[PDB]
Amino acid sequence: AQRVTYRRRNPYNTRSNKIKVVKTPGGKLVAQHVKKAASRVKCGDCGSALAGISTLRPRQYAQVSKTHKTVQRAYGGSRCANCVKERIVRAFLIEEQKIVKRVLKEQQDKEK
Amino acid sequence: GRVIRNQRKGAGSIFTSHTRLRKGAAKLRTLDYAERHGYIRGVVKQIIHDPGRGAPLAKVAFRDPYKYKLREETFIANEGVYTGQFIYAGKKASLNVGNILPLGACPEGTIVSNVEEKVGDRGALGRTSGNYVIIIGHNPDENKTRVKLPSGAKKIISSDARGVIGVVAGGGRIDKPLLKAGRAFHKYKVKRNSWPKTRGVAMNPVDHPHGGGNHQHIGKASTISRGAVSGQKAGLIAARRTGLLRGTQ
Amino acid sequence: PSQKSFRTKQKLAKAQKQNRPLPQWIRLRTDNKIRYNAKRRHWRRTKLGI
Amino acid sequence: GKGTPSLGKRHNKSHTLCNRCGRRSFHVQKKTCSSCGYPAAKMRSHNWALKAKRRRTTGTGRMAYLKHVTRRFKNGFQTGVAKAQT
RNA sequence: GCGAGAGACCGAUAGCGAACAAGUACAGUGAUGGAAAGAUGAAAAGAACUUUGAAAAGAGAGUGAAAAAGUACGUGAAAUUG
RNA sequence: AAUAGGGUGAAGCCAGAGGAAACUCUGGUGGAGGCUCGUAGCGGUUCUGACGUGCAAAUCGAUCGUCGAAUUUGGGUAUAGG
RNA sequence: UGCUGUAAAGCUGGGUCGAACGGCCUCUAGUGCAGAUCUUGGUGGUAGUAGCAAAUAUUCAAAUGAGAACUUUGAAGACUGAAGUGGGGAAAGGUUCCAUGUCAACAGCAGUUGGACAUGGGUUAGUCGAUCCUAAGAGAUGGGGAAGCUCCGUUUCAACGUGCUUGAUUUUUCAGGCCAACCAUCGAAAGGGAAUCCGGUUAAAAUUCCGGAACUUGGAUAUGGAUUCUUCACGGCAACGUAACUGAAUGUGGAGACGUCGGCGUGAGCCCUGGGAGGAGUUAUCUUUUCUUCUUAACAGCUUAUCACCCUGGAAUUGGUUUAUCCGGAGAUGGGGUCUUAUGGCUGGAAGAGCGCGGUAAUUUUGCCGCGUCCGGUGCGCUUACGACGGUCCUUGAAAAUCCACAGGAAGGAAUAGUUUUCAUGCCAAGUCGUACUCAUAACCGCAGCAGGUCUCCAAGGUUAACAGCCUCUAGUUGAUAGAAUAAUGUAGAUAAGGGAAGUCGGCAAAAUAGAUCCGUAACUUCGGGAUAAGGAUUGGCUCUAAGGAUCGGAACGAUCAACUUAGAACUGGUACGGACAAGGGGAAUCUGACUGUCUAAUUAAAACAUAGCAUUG
RNA sequence: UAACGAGAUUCCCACUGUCCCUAUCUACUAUCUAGCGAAACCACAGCCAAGGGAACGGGCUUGGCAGAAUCAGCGGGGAAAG
RNA sequence: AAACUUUCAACAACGGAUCUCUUGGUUCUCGCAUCGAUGAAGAACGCAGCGAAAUGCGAUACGUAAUAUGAAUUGCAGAUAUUCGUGAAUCAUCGAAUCUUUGAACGCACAUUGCGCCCUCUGGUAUUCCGGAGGGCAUGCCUGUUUGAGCGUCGUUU
């Protein structure tokens, strides 16, 4: 079987020196240098992988269109759907209770 | 003779602490206006392992009172503190586990941790896992508080000094045997170079005051004066007594 | 090695240029005393120390 | 194995060429020349090594400027040009 | 250091380490250590040419006052050797 | 950055059998351990083998210890002569 | 050649030689050698002696040459045997690379050969590295010590911006608006990191050259599209979708960015295999046979997934479900969807390339022509990548540069027209240094062409548990002074009647055992072990039998396809059979250290050190 | 004190050239040749017996004796070398 | 008797003593006072018609200018080189210059031929991007200039 060599001066099996074995149109088995695998964009609240967002190595986000990097919603490419939903419900309920506690305070600032 | 292993540690070449993996210094907030006059509220974001520490640390996010910003603090996690818990710090903070209060605002018998020796030093006393400080009493006329430290010592601290209500998490760690040299190796691998220890009696007279002899033996009293000099203080330094502790102390 | 600095490669260029035999027309000059280049260097024998 | 076997593990230079004196005495990790003392402002020299002073002193190089100070002094440090005789 | 004049000095294992492409060659990671090595002849006139030999060389010849001066060069001791 | 192939078979889990209960027995599954046999590796026990003006200023051969961690190792870096 | 003197010595004949030198009266001293394991140089005996013996191995012929054991070519015989004697690299070397010539020295024989000697030639980058970032750390500044060389310190008791962003102004002046926690700098050719592939080409260079085909960053910039009269787009219940589809200061997040092990799953390459189309080999006989070609890069488009998420619905007779038991009223099963594109498929790249054949051109630079290059299958296979999981820790397994998104709502925006280079297309540019070769039983270090040492990647067939050992394919070597004999003594290795440790300090050395299946297994025990305890049986070849699955068809059944495991039987043979290879001897006790681990490199590996555990001290 | 041990020791089974008691065989040496070619060491050297003697002589004294040139082995002596 | 061994002589070797030289050394005396930010000493790398070293020099590179002198240089070659002359050779002299990369070494950095910024000019459809040429940007301290800071502080006005 044909055997392959590294294509660069690095002779060590490091994280940035990973290779694949590929057959060329010349009928040859050569090494193809493989880039490090990209990690998924994650939610800033819960840490889960965001849907609808491309998995790219950080510099590659600069060279891709905006629809790949975001989702059409508030906090689109930053927070997930459930964490945005919980933020909205929490904000509404808490501000409602702030109004309730204010009118109640004015109710106890006129009878006691 | 030779410079002994006691004395080689002060130069701190290979005897500095291994601190690459440490998650920051555990401190209270800087004592500011909000803590001196009212309270400020933060939220627990993380409870994490600090290598070299038995106690977990809590990452707590506070708002900056003066600029639009978030301030992340590294507290020592008290047991029962959870992620998403609201932490209140200040003079007017309530007596709940995890809240940071001045010592004078805590009644007698209050269990408190990461207590300040001096007002604003951000925590000195009772910081290891399972340890705490008991508030013994108050002297409001002199603005002083009497506390009991984990060693059993009674201390008088300013009543303005702060502490965190509860017991430091991670207690009971010493209850389990290490069982292995490798376990101690991994324990000190992220602490410092103090393990393993060769017995001085097993060395030569150059290496140690206990070295030498046709049998391994100390040869002179291993209780050493407090006024002895470096290179002599090997053994039981300024020992008031020796031998098995019998009866109460 | 293949990966070398410019300063190294410049020293190796001078070391190659100094390792030549004597030009023969020099022995014909009047009052000439040099019979051969006495500062030859073989790669395996004497190292450059660079 | 402290002789021949240990001598086979020598491939990490402690010293490289110095920029001031070009001698291969520049300690890489110390960033200092053991010969001329670079990068210190002064040149490294000792009275207990007189032969070392001999090896590197005035006259062992070109003296591209001190060559001519004596000849300029003998003429009183002339300014101008020589005048052609009639 | 620069420029001079000298000596009851040494005479190439001496005199400076160095009379010479000497602080050179070379060693050492490094600080440093550090040699050996002058002389054909007045002049290369450094042996054209022939011959044997694969060649180096040899044998004739030639130059020279001398080749009992041929660069493996003045003289050419001893050990050692034919 | 590196470390064949086997053995043993810890928790946890599934099923069956027995029991009034407190609980017990059996068959699987699972894949623990500074566990074990044993390569590479790392080491260096014995022959008191070879060699001992050596291949070698420490090697060679067989035999042997250990071989998933207190493991082995490159490079970078720190510690310097009482 | 002699003479003189007791002598230290003086004189003289002959030969050689070529430029200075002596007697006498005095002066002066670095003034007399057999020794100092004296110093430097030179030379012997030893002595044509010790020796030139590891790494299986060479042989015939031709060519060349004065000369061939050693050079070249051919033929053969071998070996390394993919953890290589193969193909590359890091450190280190530095021209050893290639061609031509060449043999004085060197290659411990030789030499026509060479890593030698001589003369030339040779290393091509926007995409590979360096360069940049920060790591452990190193280290200026402000300061503070120190007689001082210098020491401390790394933002520190400092008034620390050669600040940016705009509207500009052409008034080459400005107007301001924001900030200044941190932030000198150096520190990785294995960490982090913008972007390139295939085919061809040289004597020697190639991810660098040639041909073709791409990509990134920075800049410039127009057209098309998109958007606006509801000014800064629509659709979907939703997960979210798209060719686009404003967004300042400031803020919040994400990526960069992360241990190790275990089994499982998927892919790729390799291994195996059927048909067909070619070529070669065997052919007394047999063999629809044995070997070999049948390939497809980066890049672009469409499609493709475990996990995760959304909508519906409302669950005990609890159901779903993994090799591994986890999930569900905090919403399971069921039904329908969304997403990441890891990975595969199709197409473009691209057959025009490469490969395999056949037929022709020619001193001939170099070719020209024709045909084919197709369709499958298989898996506890090997390696490797990824995935979803599970275990583990008093151990929880870098940082920074850099890139993006989001929050916020400053500012600016249309109708006869307005905005934007995160949509498509188009234009320009990408500097500097390295790049040859060796990487080792001859290119490095050990004084050397030294059996030592020196980091790492790829990895075929058979046997087998096996990447072991043994044999072989590709590739590479056939190098190590040779010839003739075969005494003693050796060194390495074998065998041995009968006895069986009587040898010896001592079973040192050697022998014996050894794989697998089945049976059987004691004391003691910290209950985990001891244990492969001990101790037995079997094992080949051949011919059979049985069991163990997948996908389809509406079935306890049919069709098709498929892997090697296990068990049983008959027969068979000089009773052999883990047939080479590979591969524990065992037991009863005492001393001692609990164990795994560690040290005297180069005479001691141990009972020594360490260790968990225990205790004391501050 | 279970387990573990290249630790020290005793006994038993198996096993055997450890031994009785040796023999045979293979390769590489040694050996002989062509080529190549060191070193240690060296006062001078090299036959014994007795004597005396610095009390253990190659040399001296007295005897025995004594014939070129040598090869392979060998380890008594050279109070051999280091 | 040869051979062999030993001694001697002759011739030839080996080796380099002896003799004789000497642009070197050593020591004594006399006279003189001159390195560097106007960039030294030192280092690296280059430079010749044909050069490796030593010597000299710096991209103007075994040297340019100038003064003096007056026909060479030389191992070979060769002038668009020279001879009653602005003329060969010349570290003869020397007063004008050139003086790479560095080095106290100075934009920052340096195990890198790494990275800036400012001014003028210039090329590419460019105040901003890319290229090129030239000139600049170190620190401590002194005098002065300008711009500032401080309820340190003087005068005046609500």
Ligand SMILES: CC[C@H]1CN2CCc3cc(OC)c(OC)cc3[C@@H]2C[C@@H]1C[C@H]1NCCc2cc(O)c(OC)cc21
């Ligand atoms: C031609 C090769 C054989 C010849 N024969 C003849 C008979 C025989 C008989 C033996 O005993 C019956 C014996 O005992 C050992 C050796 C021999 C020798 C050994 C030699 C090879 C051997 N030479 C020495 C060491 C060695 C090392 C290796 O790596 C290695 O691999 C190729 C091989 C070797």
Ligand SMILES: [Mg+2]
């Ligand atoms: Mg890298």
Ligand SMILES: [Mg+2]
């Ligand atoms: Mg999207």
Ligand SMILES: [Mg+2]
């Ligand atoms: Mg201890």
Ligand SMILES: [Mg+2]
């Ligand atoms: Mg201890």
Ligand SMILES: [Mg+2]
């Ligand atoms: Mg000791």
Ligand SMILES: [Mg+2]
């Ligand atoms: Mg003492």
Ligand SMILES: [Mg+2]
């Ligand atoms: Mg004492």
Ligand SMILES: [Mg+2]
């Ligand atoms: Mg003692």
Ligand SMILES: [Mg+2]
């Ligand atoms: Mg002792």
Ligand SMILES: [Mg+2]
């Ligand atoms: Mg003791």
Ligand SMILES: [Mg+2]
């Ligand atoms: Mg006592």
Ligand SMILES: [Mg+2]
């Ligand atoms: Mg009592």
Ligand SMILES: [Mg+2]
């Ligand atoms: Mg170092």
Ligand SMILES: [Mg+2]
């Ligand atoms: Mg001399």
Ligand SMILES: [Mg+2]
């Ligand atoms: Mg001398």
